[PDB]
């Protein structure tokens, strides 16, 4: 039976990971057809980070000063473009590995797996959420920038994340695809602030029901709630309200517990308010909510793909 | 910075994935060079594995009795053997994909990374470790069986694991790849108590240098101990004592944090002593004991492969 914090397998995506050198600055880029990704920072010299002139810098380069090595082989590069905060490197070799893949932005709340990459090498997988406010609570050192995070759809890998950067608070900050920021944060040292973070309530609630699921069930209660009652009390804990859409989300773990989401609301507004008096769910003593409710149904079904 | 649970990446097992049907029974094997490892029991009916006689039920099966689909492809199977709780398939196809790759038995304490499948297809990834007493706590279904538990050296493959059983606790059983348990489990459906499970002391140590590494500090004290004297109040709570190799296991961490293992170990006893109080290390309000100090290195140092 059993619940986990799972990754999909990283094998399409580590065929697509590259080491990009310029300068004396290296990270990892993404080798899709005969487009290379990374992070356009990568133009910058470790100490003149506190606010670059991204065009006049990138001005002062041609394709010879970038070096593309795959594993321990060099690209030609033969065309640069900037796209917002990312570097598109045009090279000569198409990837021969290049999966089936697409670009999506995701929304907060969110999941997707992490590739950690050094040097154009995989470290470690690992599964994150984009919290509400557009962090991600990763694990990334000196590196690890241009390090990717995606979702697979059977065969399809959909990239939605690039690292480049950790928050003073200690978590993450990158951009889709495309180079857009998640969040209100800009690719330059100075200090920045994540908002508050808040609790996404639907999550949590799709873990309850994963304990339900696996047999942990001592948390519920001979008690429901309201929708609009629920959500007063959520807010004076920085949970995101929960609405209609979040109830027919749930609506699989539902059917399949025969929990009503309201009667679950009611258990999880009675935790929130008494704490959890030192007992665990799923071996966890806190609430957890960096599963999605697909999250919760894959894994507690096995969907597979490849 | 960040610290999470980290799987290696699975591209090099992924490849080695295999679906294996014998009558109505299908799970996972494992493809490497011309022969096919999965377990015995697959020769095995759903309802009749109360107390299988695995020689006589081998016995009237045949190589051709034996369907090893790999994605969409059929390998001819051409010797079998039974070794322990496992099946060896000979086939004529050599796998294209095999990795270097070795079989370890892991001891208690050590993690590994797991590639849970359904029929020979990838569902996910995560990092494992072996209880003291020989169970996991996984995340398997129906189909899970056959799944491997590995560790990457660099570019070999070390299988340290198969999964075979869930316990009636909800952990997990299985083997190495020679096909011997780990712990007093045997493959057939009865009542199998795994004993008592232990905290291993030592990785939870390794955990505490990777809070104090990763700024979480707070439960750092003005004490120390002795070895003996921690050992005493350690076996009360069911850690696994420490010993002198715990003590020089950590060094490296020791070494990186300036502080000696036994004022680690004095932040640890009270710890046990007087709880969390209601805070958090690494977001965690529970004592992890799922690192081990090498896997704390590797991700406070960035260690890669391929
Ligand atoms: C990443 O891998 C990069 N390293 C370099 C090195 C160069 F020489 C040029 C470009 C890049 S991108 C870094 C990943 C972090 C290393 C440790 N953990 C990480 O997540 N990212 C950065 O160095 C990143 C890039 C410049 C400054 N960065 C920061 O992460 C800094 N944080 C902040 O400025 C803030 F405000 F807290 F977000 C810092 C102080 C180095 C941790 C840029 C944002 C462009
Ligand atoms: C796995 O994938 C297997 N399924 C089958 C189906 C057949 F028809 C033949 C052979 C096999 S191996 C099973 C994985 C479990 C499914 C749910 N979660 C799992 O981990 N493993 C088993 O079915 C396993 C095999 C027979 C009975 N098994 C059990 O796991 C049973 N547990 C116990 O008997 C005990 F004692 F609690 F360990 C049970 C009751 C089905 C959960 C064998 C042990 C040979």
Redesign the interface.
């Given at each position: 039976?059993?619940?986990?914090?799972?990754?999909?397998?990283?094998?399409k995506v580590?065929?697509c990971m590259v080491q990009v050198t310029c300068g004396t600055t290296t990270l990892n880029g993404l080798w899709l057809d005969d487009v290379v990704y990374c992070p356009r920072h990568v133009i910058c010299t470790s100490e003149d980070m506190l606010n670059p002139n991204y065009e006049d810098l990138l001005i002062r380069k041609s394709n010879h000063n970038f070096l593309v090595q795959a594993?321990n082989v060099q690209l030609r590069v033969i065309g640069h473009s900037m796209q917002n905060c990312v570097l598109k490197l045009k090279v000569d070799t198409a990837n021969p590995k290049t999966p089936k893949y697409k670009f999506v932005r995701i929304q907060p709340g969110q999941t997707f797996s992490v590739?950690?990459?050094?040097?154009g090498?995989?470290?470690?997988?690992?599964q994150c959420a984009m919290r509400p406010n557009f962090t991600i609570?990763?694990?990334?050192?000196?590196?690890?920038c241009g390090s990717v995070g995606f979702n697979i759809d059977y065969d399809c890998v959909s990239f939605c994340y690039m690292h480049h950067m950790?928050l003073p608070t200690?978590?993450?900050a990158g951009t889709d695809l495309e180079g857009n920021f998640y969040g209100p944060f800009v690719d330059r040292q100075t200090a920045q602030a994540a908002g508050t973070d808040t609790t996404i309530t639907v999550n949590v609630l799709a873990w309850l029901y994963a304990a339900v699921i696996?047999?942990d069930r001592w948390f519920l209660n001979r008690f429901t709630t309201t929708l609009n009652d629920f959500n007063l009390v959520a807010m004076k804990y920085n949970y995101e309200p929960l609405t209609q859409d979040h109830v027919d989300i749930l609506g699989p773990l539902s059917a399949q517990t025969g929990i009503a989401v309201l009667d679950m609301c009611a258990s999880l507004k009675e935790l929130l308010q008494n704490?959890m008096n030192?007992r665990?769910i799923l071996?966890?003593?806190?609430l957890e909510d960096e599963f999605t409710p697909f999250d919760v149904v894959?894994?507690?079904?096995?969907?597979?793909?490849?």
């Open positions: 039976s059993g619940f986990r914090k799972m990754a999909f397998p990283s094998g580590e065929g594993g590739l950690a990459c050094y040097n090498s995989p470290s470690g997988v690992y609570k990763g694990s990334f050192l000196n590196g690890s950790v200690g978590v993450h696996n047999g704490g030192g665990t071996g966890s003593a806190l894959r894994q507690c079904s096995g969907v597979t793909f490849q």
